Design a protein around this ligand. Structure first.
Ligand SMILES: Nc1ccn([C@H]2CC[C@@H](COP(=O)(O)OP(=O)(O)OP(=O)(O)O)O2)c(=O)n1
Ligand SMILES: [Mg+2]
Length: 528
DNA sequence: GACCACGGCGCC
DNA sequence: GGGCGCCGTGGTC
């Protein structure tokens, strides 16, 4: 039943944007649904001034757009989060809708009505889900607001810097491709893997080390190519071209084009329901994968700067995953090396050369790397490799024990979970194909650690944001086990110290949570 | 122009 | 080799 725009309080929104990014979208339509009536706003924008909060599907998004228009409108209940927690594979409105009672259409009114209806069913399904309900009420919902503020804020970028970088890299790529072409004895599209495969394996005589997955073609991966670096002198030239071209096309060239007019900052999206483990995801500008490994990568990182008069504050948990594993495992020995405070790697071993061998087996257990994978990972083949791990599970019995327990529970229950009860169903755990089953197994015992580490971070963000706001500081980015903040120079140290303390004691476990902090005028300098 | 599958690769 | 998202290349509509 259609009723005049002003909806009663507690209504469920329903809006249509001209595009996916709320920071670039136009509010084409806005509607609300309550009880049984449906109210449409004749003027969406002015309408927003009537809502006290965004209640409904993708609330945060409409909330982001409200913020960009100077409206405090906070996001509230959002069935997507409910569905997401019930099943982490619930990632789109299209799917949750079809799966729980509706159709994701393009009408603001039907979307609003869809929101209400969807929330009822989903909420009901959360019956007796004390843990899931806890994650919704105490983490998911409240965090949805932190994210809206994060996206609205944005991060300052050195646009003239990257532009200068572009021309310079362009010339280096040209010298590189010019060189490989002379080595192949002729040019070709070096961006074409198919064309490069023929040059490497077909035309030249380089041994094809591996084949692709879906198409089964001879691969030209960096791995295949790193091994072939000794053969032809073209291999290296190709390897640098790839890096350069990867960095230019992905960061140096598109980023400056994404700056916002009204802000002059990069406004990335922080998707709350796009991962199977419970991790967050950054899209459109994906600011969760900015380079940092190679020199040129670092030159790019320096491009992310703080407002004039502010400082960047980067905080990273220290191997939060190995720690969550110690807690999850309850492995005295592991929980002891952290307690305490001995170099995980160093202490594990109990040299240098070996320390690069005792940290890999400790972290490679997060996916259970194969002995053949380790043989080629280290020096000693699958002979001493399998052994150079026989002590891992021999030193850390409960870990291997835990991995076993989680899996069995996974086969029986049909899903696995995090310290807080976040769950993920891994059906292929009972598959008849070794190949697929052991693949599910790796996703299976990995989820708890990755998901627990995420729950912890999401909770840290939830508690830290308010204090930050009270301090005049801001949360800019999150990169899974780290956060990037922005604070006035006069408060940077006080903000760093606080965030660090908040993050470290977010949720005490058998082992301490260690956080390293850094301040600087740019991301690289803040020591990210 | 918009979008797809795929190989490849950036980060956690 | 666990979790993502983005970029060209080829090829579709
Ligand atoms: N190559 C990697 C790196 C990280 N991770 C996961 C497990 C650890 C978590 C955070 O990664 P980093 O921040 O890179 O490492 P860290 O060990 O947590 O901490 P530090 O910053 O001291 O390296 O993400 C992963 O799966 N694969
Ligand atoms: Mg870290």
């Amino acid at each position: 039943e259609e009723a005049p725009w002003p909806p009663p309080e507690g209504a469920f929104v329903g809006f249509v944007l001209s595009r996916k990014e709320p920071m670039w979208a136009d509010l084409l339509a806005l509607a609300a649904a309550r009880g049984g009536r449906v109210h449409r706003a004749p003027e969406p924008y002015k309408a927003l001034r009537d809502l006290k909060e965004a209640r409904g599907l993708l609330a945060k998004d409409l909330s982001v757009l409200a913020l960009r228009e100077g409206l405090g409108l906070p996001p509230g209940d959002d069935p997507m989060l409910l569905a997401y927690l019930l099943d982490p594979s619930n990632t789109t409105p299209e799917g949750v809708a079809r799966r729980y009672g509706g159709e994701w259409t393009e009408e603001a009114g039907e979307r609003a009505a869809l929101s209400e209806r969807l929330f009822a069913n989903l909420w009901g399904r959360l019956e007796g889900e004390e843990r899931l309900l806890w994650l919704y009420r105490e983490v998911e919902r409240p965090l949805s607001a932190v994210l809206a503020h994060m996206e609205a804020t944005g991060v300052r970028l050195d646009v003239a810097y990257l532009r200068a970088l572009s021309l310079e890299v362009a010339e280096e790529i040209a010298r590189l491709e010019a060189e490989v072409f002379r080595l192949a004895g002729h040019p070709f599209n070096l961006n074409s893997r198919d064309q490069l495969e023929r040059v490497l394996f077909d035309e030249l005589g380089l041994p094809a080390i591996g084949k692709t997955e879906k198409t089964g073609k001879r691969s030209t991966s960096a791995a295949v190519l790193e091994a072939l670096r000794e053969a032809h002198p073209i291999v290296e030239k190709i390897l640098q071209y790839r890096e350069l071209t990867k960095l230019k096309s992905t960061y140096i060239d598109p980023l400056p084009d994404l700056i916002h007019p009204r802000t002059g900052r990069l406004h990335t999206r922080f998707n709350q329901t796009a991962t199977a483990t419970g991790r967050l995801s950054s899209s459109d500008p994906n600011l969760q994968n900015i380079p940092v490994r190679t020199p040129l990568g670092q030159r790019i990182r320096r491009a992310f700067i703080a407002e004039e008069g502010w400082l960047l504050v980067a905080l990273d948990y220290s191997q939060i995953e190995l720690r969550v594993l110690a807690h999850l495992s309850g492995d005295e020995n592991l929980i002891r090396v952290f307690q305490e405070g001995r170099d995980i790697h160093t202490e594990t071993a109990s040299d240098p050369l070996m320390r690069r061998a005792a940290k890999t087996i400790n972290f490679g257990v997060l996916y259970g790397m194969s002995a053949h994978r380790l043989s080629q990972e280290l020096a000693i083949p699958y002979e001493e490799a399998q052994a150079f791990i026989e002590r891992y599970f021999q030193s850390f019995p409960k870990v291997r024990a835990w991995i076993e327990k989680t899996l069995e529970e996974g086969r029986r229950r049909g899903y696995v979970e995090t310290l807080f009860g976040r769950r993920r169903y891994v059906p292929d755990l009972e598959a008849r194909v070794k190949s697929v089953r052991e693949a599910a197994e790796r996703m299976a015992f990995n989820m708890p650690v990755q998901g627990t580490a995420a729950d912890l971070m999401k909770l840290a963000m939830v508690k830290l944001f308010p204090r930050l706001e009270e301090m005049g500081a801001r949360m800019l980015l999150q990169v899974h086990d780290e956060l990037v903040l922005e604070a006035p120079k006069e408060r940077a140290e006080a903000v760093a110290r606080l965030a660090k303390e908040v993050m470290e004691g977010v949720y005490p476990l058998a082992v301490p949570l260690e956080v390293e902090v850094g301040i600087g005028e740019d991301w690289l300098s803040a020591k990210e």
